[PDB]
Design a protein around this motif. Structure first.
Motif, short mmCIF file in Angstrom:
data_model
loop_
_atom_site.label_atom_id
_atom_site.label_comp_id
_atom_site.label_asym_id
_atom_site.label_seq_id
_atom_site.Cartn_x
_atom_site.Cartn_y
_atom_site.Cartn_z
N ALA A 107 -0.07 90.06 -1.28
CA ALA A 107 -1.00 88.75 -1.23
C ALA A 107 -2.10 88.99 -0.13
N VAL A 108 -3.30 88.73 -0.50
CA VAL A 108 -4.48 88.80 0.42
C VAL A 108 -5.56 87.42 0.20
N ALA A 109 -5.99 87.14 1.21
CA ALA A 109 -6.91 85.93 1.05
C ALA A 109 -8.15 86.41 0.15
N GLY A 110 -8.42 85.24 -0.91
CA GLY A 110 -9.41 85.70 -1.94
C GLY A 110 -10.56 84.64 -1.71
N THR A 111 -10.44 83.82 -0.94
CA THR A 111 -11.68 82.93 -0.78
C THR A 111 -11.82 82.84 0.75
N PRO A 112 -12.80 82.25 1.08
CA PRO A 112 -13.14 82.18 2.58
C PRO A 112 -12.07 81.05 3.18
N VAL A 139 4.16 81.28 -3.96
CA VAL A 139 5.20 82.05 -3.07
C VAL A 139 5.31 81.13 -2.00
N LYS A 140 6.49 80.58 -1.71
CA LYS A 140 6.84 79.93 -0.42
C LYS A 140 7.68 80.47 0.41
N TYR A 141 7.43 80.17 1.54
CA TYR A 141 8.48 80.86 2.97
C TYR A 141 9.01 79.86 3.62
N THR A 142 9.74 80.37 4.76
CA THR A 142 10.22 79.25 5.66
C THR A 142 9.17 78.32 5.97
N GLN A 143 8.13 78.62 6.60
CA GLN A 143 7.25 78.04 7.02
C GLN A 143 5.80 78.57 6.38
N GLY A 144 5.41 77.71 5.55
CA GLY A 144 4.05 78.05 4.69
C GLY A 144 4.16 78.33 3.44
N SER A 145 3.11 78.33 2.39
CA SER A 145 3.11 78.69 1.10
C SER A 145 1.47 79.06 0.73
N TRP A 146 1.52 79.62 -0.61
CA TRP A 146 0.22 80.00 -0.94
C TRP A 146 0.23 79.96 -2.75
N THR A 147 -0.68 79.86 -3.33
CA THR A 147 -1.18 80.19 -4.72
C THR A 147 -2.09 81.08 -4.89
N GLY A 148 -2.15 81.98 -5.71
CA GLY A 148 -2.91 83.10 -5.79
C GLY A 148 -2.80 83.62 -7.40
N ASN A 156 -0.88 75.77 5.35
CA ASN A 156 -0.10 75.98 6.74
C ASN A 156 0.27 77.59 6.52
N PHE A 157 -0.62 78.61 5.59
CA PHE A 157 -0.23 79.86 5.67
C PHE A 157 -1.24 80.50 6.61
N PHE A 158 -2.58 80.24 6.52
CA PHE A 158 -3.56 80.86 7.60
C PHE A 158 -3.41 79.92 8.45
N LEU A 159 -3.04 80.27 9.83
CA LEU A 159 -3.01 79.16 10.86
C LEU A 159 -4.04 79.69 11.90
N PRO A 160 -4.52 78.77 12.74
CA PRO A 160 -5.49 79.03 13.87
C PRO A 160 -4.82 79.76 14.91
N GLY A 161 -5.60 81.20 14.91
CA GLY A 161 -4.98 81.98 15.79
C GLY A 161 -4.63 83.35 15.45
N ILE A 162 -4.15 83.34 14.03
CA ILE A 162 -3.70 84.70 13.19
C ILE A 162 -4.78 85.63 13.49
N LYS A 163 -4.52 86.79 13.50
CA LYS A 163 -5.64 87.96 13.22
C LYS A 163 -5.36 88.56 11.81
N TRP A 164 -4.24 88.28 11.03
CA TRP A 164 -4.28 88.74 9.69
C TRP A 164 -5.06 88.07 8.71
N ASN A 165 -5.25 88.51 7.33
CA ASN A 165 -5.58 87.71 6.38
C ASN A 165 -4.96 88.02 5.12
N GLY A 166 -3.72 88.69 5.14
CA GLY A 166 -2.92 89.04 3.89
C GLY A 166 -1.63 89.12 4.43
N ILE A 167 -0.51 89.69 3.51
CA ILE A 167 0.77 89.76 3.91
C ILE A 167 1.19 90.68 2.80
#
Length: 367
Positions: A36-41, A66-75, A104-115
């Motif tokens: 999964a990758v960010a698809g919007t700004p 998809v939901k994780y221990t901490q954070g979730s997204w829809t795509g 709470n998937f894309f957090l301030p400080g992270i350097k990635w934009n996909g998983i």
């Protein structure tokens, strides 16, 4: 045997996606199974994947959450080409989820934009039938169903990652012998823990408590996570074996940090995890030194690198940072080996040794 550079809490690789290729930073996650990758700004990322720009992208007309221990997204789910040049092959056709909503998937400080989920199909959403990224790679490139990770961020404070080897193993990335432990269940990378030792003294817990629900190897988890009872037992044993007279509760909880040239590493004991060998009559042990679970955050302040869980015993990045880890899916085993890249200032951060007889422990420690 494709060897991809890693950079680095989380280790990510540079991935070229689409036609013309777009360059994104993708977190390597062996605890999930979706690409999964960010698809919007998004405020906390600097780039994202734009489907409009890719000629090769094809929507499959549905969403997934998809939901994780901490954070979730829809795509949105579709397919596109990921460019990993080798031979007469430019790219591979893979399933991809393009994220348009998340919390709470894309957090301030992270350097990635996909998983990049590198676990088994069982964990893939919406169903197991949504072909994994690595399975796509294996089938299209006919490479061995194996990948290995060398993480070299040991000692790097939270404020060159290593290597991801796709299709096999790179002898240059480890030293000594490889010790293999069986994969008990193919969903996460679930292994069987038999014993935990602190400062040379064993925890006298039933070996099923280390496996209550599951013990897994997950590069997507930062810390070493332990079931509550295991965590309480570890904290007590660490405090006793430590040269430090007293500990605040916040230190163990991670609510507080200890600030110090001199390292607190020589005041803490070693922690060893015994794992059953492929030969069921034997075990080996992976040992982490304080350099790995007493972690620098910035004069330096350190945090306890172990946290309590409810469900699982997660062998996270702070343990994998001491070894070269081999995810041998073709032979249903996980391999560990000493990693020269893990040393800090020429001093080891981990040990590995064996064999040890398993005559004194139950034939199966997974309840």
């Amino acid at each position: 045997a494709m060897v991809d550079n890693l950079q680095g809490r989380g280790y990510y690789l540079e991935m070229l996606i689409g036609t013309p290729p777009q360059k994104l930073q993708i977190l390597v996650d062996t605890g999930s199974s979706n690409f999964a990758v960010a698809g919007t700004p998004h405020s906390y990322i600097d780039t994202y994947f734009d489907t409009e720009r890719s000629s090769t992208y094809r929507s499959k007309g549905f969403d997934v959450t998809v939901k994780y221990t901490q954070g979730s997204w829809t795509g949105f789910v579709g397919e596109d080409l990921v460019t990993i040049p080798k031979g007469f092959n430019t790219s591979f056709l893979v399933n991809i989820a393009t994220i348009f909503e998340s919390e709470n998937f894309f957090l301030p400080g992270i350097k990635w934009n996909g998983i990049l989920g590198l676990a088994y199909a069982t964990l893939a959403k919406p169903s197991s039938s949504l072909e994994t990224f690595f399975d796509s790679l294996v089938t299209q490139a006919n490479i061995p169903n194996v990948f290995s990770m060398q993480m070299c961020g040991a000692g790097l404070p939270v404020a060159n990652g290593g290597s991801l080897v796709l299709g096999g193993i790179e002898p240059s990335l480890y030293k000594g012998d490889i010790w293999y432990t069986p994969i008990k269940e193919e969903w996460y990378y679930q292994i069987e823990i038999l014993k935990l030792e602190i400062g040379g003294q064993s925890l006298n817990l039933d070996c099923r408590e280390y496996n209550a629900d599951k013990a897994i190897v997950d590069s997507g988890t930062t810390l070493l996570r332990l079931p509550q009872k295991v965590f309480d037992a570890v904290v007590e044993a660490v405090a006793r074996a430590s040269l430090i007279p007293a500990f605040s509760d916040g230190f163990w909880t991670g609510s507080q940090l200890a600030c110090w040239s001199e390292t607190p590493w020589s005041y803490f004991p070693k922690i060893s995890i015994y794992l059953r060998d492929e030969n069921s009559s034997r075990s080996f042990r992976i040992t982490i030194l304080p350099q790995l679970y007493i972690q620098p955050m910035m004069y330096e302040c350190y945090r306890f690198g172990i946290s309590p869980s409810t469900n699982a015993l997660v062998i996270g990045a702070t343990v994998m940072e001491g070894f070269y880890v081999i995810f041998d899916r073709a032979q249903k085993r996980v391999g560990f080996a000493a990693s020269p890249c893990a040393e800090i200032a020429g001093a080891a951060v981990s040990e590995i040794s064996g064999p040890f007889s398993t005559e004194d422990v139950a034939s199966n420690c997974v309840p």
